[PDB]
C-alpha cells in the first residue's frame, strides 16, 4: 500500500510542491517499496541510519537524501558527506561549520534554516531576531547553498494555530528575502502528516511525510 499511499498524495499536490518521504523508523525495504512508485525524495533525522541504509541501496541510483533533525558538530562531516540537503540548521555556528567542512570537502548542500516561531519546548530552532542579525554573515557563505526555511509546529496545535504559523513562516521569508538579495530563499519546508495540506495552502514548496506514506513504526 506504500504505492497507493504516494498515488494519492500525489494526485492533490500542485506543481510546486515536492514531498519528501520521511523514511526514519522504517527499513531500506520501505524505501526500496516507495522508490519502485517512483519516489526518490527521502528524509532521515539520524546520520548513521541514513548512512547504514545507504550501504544497503546501492541498486537505486538517483536518490537524494534530506536530514531532518538535530545537527550536532560531532556529525557535522558525516552529514556533508551523505546528504544532498540539510534542514534542520538552527544556528550560525552550524552553519559556518557546514560551509567550511563543505570546501574541504568541494560540496555545496542545499540548507533550510529552522526556525523557532512559537513557543516549542521539543525542538530547537532560530530566533527570528537572532536570523535577521546573522543574514549579512550568512549571505556570505560560499559554500552551501541556504535554499529556505523550515517551520515544525509545535505539538498539539490546532488547526488554525497550524495554519497562522505556516502563514508566519512565508511572510518571515519574504521579509529576509528582501533584507538578502543574494539569498535564493525559494523554498519553505513545512508540513508533515497531520498538517500538510495547511502547509500547501500556505506555501510549502516541500512537504516532509512519514506516518501517512509509510504507516506507524
Ligand atoms: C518525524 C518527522 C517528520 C515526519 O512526521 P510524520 O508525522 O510521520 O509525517 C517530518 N519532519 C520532521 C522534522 C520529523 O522529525
Not at 537524501?65 to 552529514?79: D, F, P, T, V
Not at 557546514?98 to 526556525?115: F, M, N, T
Not at 512559537?118 to 525542538?123: G, S, T, V
Not at 554573515?137 to 497562522?164: F, K, N
Amino acid at each position: 500500500q506504500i504505492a497507493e499511499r504516494l498515488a494519492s498524495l500525489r494526485s492533490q499536490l500542485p506543481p510546486s510542491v515536492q514531498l519528501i518521504a520521511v523514511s526514519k523508523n522504517h527499513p531500506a525495504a520501505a524505501i526500496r517499496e516507495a522508490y519502485a512508485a517512483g519516489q526518490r525524495h527521502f528524509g532521515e533525522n539520524r546520520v548513521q541510519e541514513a548512512i547504514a541504509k545507504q550501504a544497503e541501496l546501492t541498486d537505486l541510483p538517483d536518490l537524494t537524501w534530506h536530514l531532518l533533525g538535530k545537527l550536532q558538530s560531532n556529525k557535522a562531516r558525516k552529514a556533508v558527506e551523505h546528504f544532498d540537503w540539510i534542514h534542520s540548521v538552527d544556528s550560525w555556528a552550524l552553519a559556518e561549520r557546514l560551509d567550511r567542512i563543505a570546501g574541504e570537502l568541494g560540496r555545496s548542500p542545499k540548507l533550510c534554516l529552522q526556525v523557532k516561531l512559537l513557543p516549542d519546548p521539543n525542538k530547537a530552532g532560530w530566533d527570528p531576531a537572532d536570523l535577521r542579525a546573522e543574514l549579512p554573515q550568512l549571505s556570505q557563505l560560499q559554500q552551501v547553498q541556504i535554499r529556505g526555511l523550515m517551520v515544525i509546529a509545535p505539538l498539539g496545535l490546532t488547526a488554525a494555530e497550524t495554519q497562522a504559523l505556516f502563514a508566519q513562516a512565508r511572510t518571515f521569508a519574504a521579509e529576509l528575502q528582501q533584507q538578502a538579495p543574494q539569498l535564493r530563499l525559494t523554498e519553505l519546508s513545512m508540513g508533515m502528516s497531520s498538517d500538510w495540506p495547511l502547509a500547501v495552502a500556505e506555501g510549502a514548496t516541500w512537504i516532509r511525510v512519514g506516518t501517512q506514506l509509510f504507516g506507524p513504526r
